């Protein structure tokens, strides 16, 4: 069960490089929330400041740190709200 869920989660939800509303349509509450977080990440990566930053210095580590902090806090808040 765990391997099925984990591999399906990877391949279906997180592996693709492109997020869509139809993508969020398929999943449940937690699935919709995490796909909207993936969409939020893609939006932020396309933001003017972050695009300029990556073009200037690359440095995906710093962007990863920022987005990971945001994602951690937001998932904590979402779980709180659901409960």
């Amino acid at each position: 069960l765990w391997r099925l869920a984990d591999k399906v989660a990877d391949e279906a939800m997180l592996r693709p490089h492109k997020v869509s509303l139809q993508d969020s349509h398929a999943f449940g509450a937690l699935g919709k929330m995490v796909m909207q977080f993936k969409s939020f990440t893609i939006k932020s990566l396309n933001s003017k400041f972050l695009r300029t930053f990556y073009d200037g210095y690359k440095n995906n580590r710093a962007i990863d740190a920022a987005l990971s902090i945001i994602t951690s806090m937001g998932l904590a808040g979402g779980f709180y709200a659901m409960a």
């Binding site: 396309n46 400041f49 210095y57 690359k58 995906n60």
Partner: protein
């Protein structure tokens, strides 16, 4: 003349994997980096054209680290050391401040400094009583990051309030 694309790839268009990203070091490269790189975090930044080989990457990293250490005393830490919010500093109109680590950041705002003894009352108090090595420096980095973030979030709040 529309032609909807429907073919956007975030890692093809937005974030292209460079040579030095996605490159897992060999043991020899790891030892070279450990011995020859002052601050390894400077390996992560690739400004301009990508260096051809790891020796140039190391040399560029050391040059950048020396420049940033030399720049900290007149850098953003020192500039912000006086009044981030008393002076209405707007971090939103700022370059990414890559080299900036809290270092020159001892926030003494002139004004808000009233009575101001130089001798502490006790042997307790005096400094930040943390017992970990490197304290007052990582604390300064956290403080500078928090000041930048909070001032920027205040500016964001004001701008969104105006828009609404």
């Amino acid at each position: 003349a529309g032609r909807l694309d429907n073919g956007f790839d975030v890692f093809k268009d937005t974030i292209t994997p460079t040579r030095w990203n996605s490159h897992i070091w060999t043991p020899e490269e790891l030892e070279k980096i450990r011995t020859e790189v002052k601050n390894p975090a400077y390996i992560n930044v690739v400004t301009g054209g990508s260096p051809e080989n790891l020796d140039d990457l190391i040399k560029l990293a050391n040059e950048n680290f020396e420049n940033d250490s030399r720049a900290a005393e007149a850098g953003l830490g020192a500039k912000l050391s006086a009044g981030i919010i008393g002076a209405g500093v707007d971090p939103l109109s700022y370059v990414p401040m890559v080299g900036v680590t809290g270092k020159g950041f001892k926030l003494i705002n002139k004004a808000l400094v009233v009575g101001a003894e130089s001798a502490a009352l006790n042997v307790a108090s005096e400094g930040l009583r943390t017992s970990v090595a490197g304290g007052d420096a990582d604390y300064a980095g956290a403080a500078l990051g928090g000041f930048v973030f909070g001032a920027g979030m205040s500016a964001i709040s004001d701008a969104v309030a105006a828009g609404l």
